[PDB]
Amino acid sequence: KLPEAYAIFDPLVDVLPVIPVLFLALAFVWQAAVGFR
């Protein structure tokens, strides 16, 4: 369990570990914007 004063942010931290993966997805959004150039 996080310390008490951060209790609030618990559901954010359950989702943080996944964000590095979201950068990979984002490079493909980006390439779709420029037409895989």
Binding site: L12, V15, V18, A25, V29, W30, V34
Partner: peptide, 27 residues
């Protein structure tokens, strides 16, 4: 939910691509 915060973050990224392509930036 957690589906609330993970949606706020999941949208962050594509929003950056959108704003540039609309306002012709260095994509």
């Amino acid at each position: 939910a957690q589906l609330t915060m993970i949606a706020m973050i999941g949208i962050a990224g594509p929003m950056i691509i959108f704003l540039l392509a609309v306002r012709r930036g260095n994509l």
